[PDB]
């Protein structure tokens, strides 16, 4: 094949500013005075979108805000002015050799001001318990930066086993992130304890942002 | 020419000046009107890439259109290369080699070479292929540059 | 309106094979090369190969050479990819893309892509459970609720709030595969003086198991 | 062209259609009268072997004279080879190589190659040399075929 | 170099008939549709003469009687109708590679009817004897074929030491050959003998054609 | 009337050198390549090399590379060949030929060639001796006579009969080199009723030793 190395895995571009990602091919993607390096964008859930073809030729219906540059081995997709909806995954593909290849992509996230995670914990509904099981669901919503550390406290004792996590893609509107922590255990386990705490550490506050409840009602 | 009705082997002839001169007058009297394409193909009876390059060169009147035609030849030539990976490379110099875009276009192929492709087991119609790319260039011009207005 | 339409999702057991489609429409099928691309969730696009309808010529990626076979059916404008000896790895979204016939060459149209699942797990409906707080949720005129759809298979499930009408404030998190089973959740935020006296129900539809349920989040 | 006044390095331009078309009309209005030679050289300002071949090809009106010109090019191309022993052979494929008669003539040399000779340590004026051979062909024709009689 | 091998060393062509000599190069003397093999003729004493250039192109002032043929590696100079004056040496040379090479040549002799050698012997003149030396000169003139065997008989004893020979080129007119044998010795040696005999054996007579003299006068 | 004129003959001792000439005339000297060829008596033609007057370019035969050096003097239309370390082998006829300037390429003109003699022997006049038979010579109205020019050096000697007027019947045999000395003979045939009462003299001229002699063949 003909490998393409994309510079950063992720890049946080503040609104109004310029996003610069680069793609470097193991070979010169040139031919007949044409640099065949293409740039695509991709919003979670949908197929790719051509932004720039021929290294610098903007595609049809692509805002002028997206620009391309490069020749032979080094290329770069430049976004400016960076606007909110631009949270997407970006890939570069060489349309030069028969085995067309893609870049590992760059995750261009919009850098919004920091925001504190709206933590909110929920006890296992009666129904899950009758089901012989019990999961305490916790929502850490609308936060920024992406990095958040949730931690559980069963009766104060740091529970770290039986907890799964899922995050959301950066909201291409309010540029925030949202995840959820789900402690799962047995109805028995649940009844073998009393107080429960979802605890998160995130730059928007040095102190643990926490939510809790005691089985007792 | 040579690839006329294929009823010619290593046989070849230089484009009769009658025909060449005809191309000139054609574009001279009709310019790039839609009829420039048909007459082109007619005066291009399965010729060699060079003969074709000669014709184009003959009536390359204004860099304006010649640019549109040039850009297209290059893009088509490059595309040909894309899907012609030279499958692991043409290892060791001495082989007739698979025709490359610049070769079919005439820039990197010698007159003899073009003949060779046009007379081999399976005949690579380098001139015919190139004759297709050029036409794509001509008809793109005609489209975005030919008539006046709603007269 | 060239349409590259292809199956939403497909579930197959390992060791089998599947022929994915891409029924082209809008344009004259034999004009452009259909390409096929694979993308594993949380990964870029791999090139499977390409095929030209009016000639059958193909160019496969050496990697996929042996796994994927590209075919076509000019008669019914449809390109296919037959994946052999399917294994868990093969589980990824498979897009079919048209390569424009004209001078400026590049991928000009993409199908929405088919999600493949190569698993042993069996189709199970989602155990939907309602989530309501104790009493603490009382800040800034906003209260949070949500459904936990647990233990289903395979993906996907379409969760909505109030028949879709309750959109703003929802966060439908991605599904994790806990032991050959999925589990996800979808939080909805209501303006304090609402839910205890307003309908806030989730409509959990799971097409695979032909199960759709509604859980009106009620104060416990 | 390129070898105009040598005040051009790797620089090169395709023969302006103005000049090419001019060659046609020239032979068209004057035929092979003694004045065909001077005008030829004028419209041949240090051009590349291909540009020259294009010109000849453009007005190759009748196989009669074109034969005399052809035979002469070949003989001159072969003579060049005689005194260019390739001194012990161009051992190992990869070298630019010493231009051969068929190369200088354009048959076995690529457009890029011709450029290379015209832009290198000890510039080999392939086009200029070829331009000399052609003229020997043209003036041999003119001599043994040009005027009528003692009118 | 690029070697040229000429078929026969010599060739006797009867008048009116066709002489055919061939030249074979180690390599093909072809280039741009031209076989660069040239044929020359040479009369004893003068420089060569171009007969045919370009393998088959007759030169200027060369009778049509001479013809050329060949291509690549094999070529042939064909004379017809062979006429007397054509007794000469013929060479072929390749005007193809820088080190132009010539053939070892062919000696095309005209085949005339056999003719007997007009032998005539001469005693050492008085003057040579006073010079302290003595050589008995014998002329074997106008004979044909070229092959003649002269032999001396000092008083009957076959003298074979002290005898030199010289032949003449085929007379481009009467097509005959002419040679001379010269027995040299000391005046003493001469006086130490009496009778002397020049003896020649030549197809025109099975018996020895001889000439002799006895010192006595 | 292009004239390629070069020295008749030359005599040098071994270990020496000689610069042979070829004064071209008639045609414009700088137009054609001068070639040099060596031919040993009783042998074909060797190619020494060639040189182009208006450029000095040369092409020598590898064999001769080291022995012969080709030069020119455009000023005085003359091509030269300098033979180094001359030895007995060098003794051969050296022709200078013009290679025609025009399309049809081939040797179009040859100089009469210079005969070289690399020897130690010293110039000595020819001992001319008369030859007349005893009495036997009386057949078919023809009697044979002749001169034996013996022991001279170097070649050549011009033998003639009766100041050249007696041509028909003469056979001037080639000269043999008996121990660094030459010897030859020239028989003349007269019509029986002639020589005993007619002038039959040989004129032996040897330019080298400035000796010319006449031997009237008289009855002994
Ligand atoms: Pb903005
Ligand atoms: Pb006759």
C95 with C133, same domain? Answer: no
Q: How far apart are CA C120 and CA F46, in angstroms?
A: 91
Helix (H) or strand (E) holding D115: helix D111-117
Helix (H) or strand (E) holding B66: helix B63-82
Q: How far apart are CA A73 and CA A4, in angstroms?
A: 9
Q: How far apart are CA E78 and CA E55, in angstroms?
A: 11
Helix (H) or strand (E) holding B102: helix B101-104
Contact of B106 with D48, CB cutoff 8 Å: no
Residue ranges with CB less than 5 Å from ion ligand 2 = E 83
- The residues facing F47 across adjacent strands are F37
Q: How far apart are CA A88 and CA A110, in angstroms?
A: 9
Q: How far apart are CA D20 and CA D59, in angstroms?
A: 10
Contact of D47 with D3, CB cutoff 8 Å: yes
CB atoms within 10 A of CB B121: 4
Residue E124 DSSP code: P
Q: How far apart are CA F134 and CA E122, in angstroms?
A: 8
Which CATH number goes with the domain that contains C208?
A: 2.60.40.10
Q: Chain D, 12-51: which have a CB under 8 Å from a chain B CB?
A: 14-15, 17, 20-21, 24, 28, 50
CB atoms within 10 A of CB C166: 19
Phi-psi region of F146 (alpha: psi -120 to 50; beta: other; left: phi over 0): left
* Residues 6 or more apart in contact with residue B48 via CB below 8 angstroms: B1, B2, B12, B111, B114, B115, B118, B126, B127
Question: Radius of gyration over alpha carbons of chain C, in Å?
Answer: 22
The full 3-state SS of C148-174, as one line of letters, equals EEEEEECCCCEEEEHHHCCCCCCEECC
Last residue of a domain, one of C90, C120, C150: C120
Which CATH number goes with the domain that contains D94?
A: 1.10.375.10
Nearest 5°: phi and psi at E53?
-115, 150
Alpha-helical regions (H) of E44-184: 126-130
Last residue of a domain, one of F120, F135, F157: F120
Nearest to F129 among E121, E125, E211 (CB): E125
Cα of F200 to nearest chain E Cα, Å: 16
Nearest to B112 among D14, D58, D107 (CB): D107
Contact of A78 with A20, CB cutoff 8 Å: yes
Structure tokens at D10: 């790797």
Chain D residues with a Cβ under 8 Å from any Cβ in chain E: 74-75, 77-78, 81-85, 87, 101-102
C-alpha dihedral, E92 to E96 to E100 to E106, nearest 10°: -10
Which residue carries 């499977």 as its tokens? Answer: C48
- Would you call E97 and D85 a contact, using CB atoms and an 8 Å cutoff? yes
Question: Does the bond joining C87 to the residue before it have cis omega, within 30 degrees of 0?
Answer: no
Q: How far apart are CA F53 and CA F95, in angstroms?
A: 17
Residues of D in Cβ contact (< 8 Å) with E36: 78, 82
Domain hosting residue B119, numbered range: 1-151
Give distance in angstroms: CA of E140 to centre of ligand 2.
Answer: 29
Closest to B8 in 3D by CA, of B123, B102, B111, B87: B123
Structure tokens at F28: 């414009």
SS3 D103: helix
F151 with F137, same domain? Answer: yes
Experimental method: X-ray
DSSP string across A93-159 = EE-SSSS-EE---EEEEEEPPPB--EEEEEPPPHHHHHTTEEEEEEEEEEEBSS--EEEE-BTTB--
Closest to F34 in 3D by CA, of F84, F77, F88: F77
- Would you call B78 and A31 a contact, using CB atoms and an 8 Å cutoff? yes
Q: How far apart are CA F166 and CA A194, in angstroms?
A: 155
F58 with F89, same domain? Answer: yes
F40 with F77, same domain? Answer: yes
A-interface mutation test, from B81, B83, B106, B108, most A Cβ less than 10 A away: B81
Full set of structural domains in chain E with CATH: 1-112 (2.60.40.10), 113-210 (2.60.40.10)
F145 with F111, same domain? Answer: no
Give distance in angstroms: CA of C50 to centre of ligand 1.
Answer: 39
Q: How far apart are CA D41 and CA F98, in angstroms?
A: 30
Cα of C63 to nearest chain B Cα, Å: 15
Question: Does the bond joining E214 to the residue before it have cis omega, within 30 degrees of 0?
Answer: no
For F130-154, b/e burial (b = at least 16 CB within 10 A) is bbbbeeebeeeeebbbbbbbbbbbb
Closest to C195 in 3D by CA, of C131, C148, C149: C131
For C52-74, b/e burial (b = at least 16 CB within 10 A) is bbeeeebbbbeebeebbbbebee
Domain hosting residue C132, numbered range: 121-219
Q: How far apart are CA A135 and CA A163, in angstroms?
A: 9
- Resolution rounded to one decimal, in angstroms: 3.7
Contact of A86 with A19, CB cutoff 8 Å: yes
Binding residues of F: 171
Cα of F14 to nearest chain E Cα, Å: 25
Q: How far apart are CA A205 and CA A201, in angstroms?
A: 7
Closest to F146 in 3D by CA, of F122, F179, F170, F168: F170
Q: How far apart are CA A34 and CA A32, in angstroms?
A: 6
Give distance in angstroms: CA of E17 to centre of ligand 2.
Answer: 9
Alpha-helical regions (H) of chain E: 126-130, 187-191
* Residues 6 or more apart in contact with residue C176 via CB below 8 angstroms: A164, A165, A166, C182, C183, C184
Residues of B in Cβ contact (< 8 Å) with C57: 83
C162 with C110, same domain? Answer: no
Last residue of a domain, one of C120, C152, C177: C120
The total domain count for chain F is 2
Q: How far apart are CA F51 and CA F80, in angstroms?
A: 10
Residue F194 DSSP code: S
C20 with C115, same domain? Answer: yes
The total domain count for chain B is 1
Q: How far apart are CA C16 and CA C12, in angstroms?
A: 7
- The residues facing A200 across adjacent strands are A150, A209
Contact of E58 with D108, CB cutoff 8 Å: no
Q: How far apart are the first and last CA of chain F?
A: 52
Q: How far apart are CA B24 and CA B22, in angstroms?
A: 5
Helix (H) or strand (E) holding E134: strand E133-143
- Would you call B83 and C57 a contact, using CB atoms and an 8 Å cutoff? yes
Ligand closest to A85 (CA) is 1
Residues of A in Cβ contact (< 8 Å) with B102: 32
DSSP string across D18-35 = HHHHHHHHHHHHHTTSTT
CB atoms within 10 A of CB B33: 12
């Amino acid at each position: 094949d003909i490998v393409l190395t994309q510079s950063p895995a992720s890049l946080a571009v503040s609104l109004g500013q310029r996003a610069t990602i680069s793609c470097r091919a193991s070979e010169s993607v040139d031919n007949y005075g044409i640099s065949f390096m293409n740039w695509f964008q991709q919003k979670p859930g949908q197929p790719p979108k051509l932004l720039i073809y021929a290294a610098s030729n903007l595609g049809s219906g692509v805002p002028a805000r997206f620009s391309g540059s490069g020749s032979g081995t080094d290329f770069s997709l430049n976004i400016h002015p960076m606007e909110e909806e631009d949270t997407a995954m970006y890939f570069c593909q060489q349309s030069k050799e028969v085995p067309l290849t893609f870049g590992a992509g760059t995750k261009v996230e919009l850098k919004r001001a920091d925001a504190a995670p709206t933590v909110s914990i929920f006890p296992p509904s009666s129904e899950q318990l009758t089901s012989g099981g019990a999961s305490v669901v916790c929502f850490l919503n609308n936060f920024y930066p992406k990095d958040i550390n949730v931690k559980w406290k069963i009766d104060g004792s740091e529970r770290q086993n039986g907890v799964l996590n899922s995050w959301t893609d950066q909201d291409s509107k309010d540029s925030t992130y949202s995840m959820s922590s789900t402690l799962t255990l047995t109805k028995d386990e649940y009844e073998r304890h009393n107080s429960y705490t979802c605890e998160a550490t995130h730059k928007t506050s040095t102190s643990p942002i926490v939510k809790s409840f005691n089985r007792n009602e | 020419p040579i690839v006329q009705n294929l009823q010619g082997q290593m046989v070849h002839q230089a484009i009769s000046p009658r025909t060449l001169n005809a191309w000139v007058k054609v574009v001279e009297e009709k310019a790039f009107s839609p009829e420039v394409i048909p007459m082109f193909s007619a005066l291009s009876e399965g010729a060699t890439p060079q003969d074709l390059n000669t014709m184009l060169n003959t009536v390359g009147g204004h860099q304006a259109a010649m640019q549109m035609l040039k850009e297209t030849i290059n893009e088509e030539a490059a595309e040909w290369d894309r899907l012609h990976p030279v499958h692991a490379g043409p290892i060791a110099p001495g082989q007739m080699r698979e025709p490359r875009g610049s070769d079919i276009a005439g820039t990197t192929s010698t007159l003899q070479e073009q003949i060779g492709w046009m007379t081999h087991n399976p005949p690579i119609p380098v001139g015919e292929i190139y004759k297709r790319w050029i036409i794509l260039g001509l008809n793109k011009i005609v489209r975005m540059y030919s008539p006046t207005s709603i007269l | 309106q060239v349409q590259l339409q292809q199956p939403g999702s497909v579930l197959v057991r390992p060791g089998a094979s599947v022929k994915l489609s891409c029924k082209a429409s809008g344009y004259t099928f034999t004009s452009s090369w259909i390409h096929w691309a694979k993308q594993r969730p949380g990964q870029g696009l791999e090139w499977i190969g390409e095929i030209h309808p009016n000639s059958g010529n193909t160019n496969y990626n050496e990697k996929f050479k042996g796994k994927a076979t590209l075919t076509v059916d000019t008669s019914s404008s449809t390109a296919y990819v037959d994946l052999s000896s399917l294994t868990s790895e093969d589980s990824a979204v498979y897009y079919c893309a048209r390569w424009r016939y004209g001078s400026p060459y590049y991928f000009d149209y993409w199908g929405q892509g088919t999600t493949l699942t190569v698993s042993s797990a069996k189709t199970t409906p989602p155990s939907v459970y309602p989530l309501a707080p104790g009493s603490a949720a009382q800040t800034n005129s906003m209260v949070t609720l949500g459904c936990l759809v647990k233990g289903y298979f395979p993906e996907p499930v379409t969760v909505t709030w109030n028949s879709g009408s309750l959109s703003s404030g929802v966060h439908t998190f991605p599904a994790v595969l806990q032991s050959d089973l999925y589990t996800l959740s979808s939080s909805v935020t209501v303006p304090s003086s609402t839910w205890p006296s307003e309908t806030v129900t989730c409509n959990v539809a799971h097409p695979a198991s032909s199960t759709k349920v509604d859980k009106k989040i009620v104060p416990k």
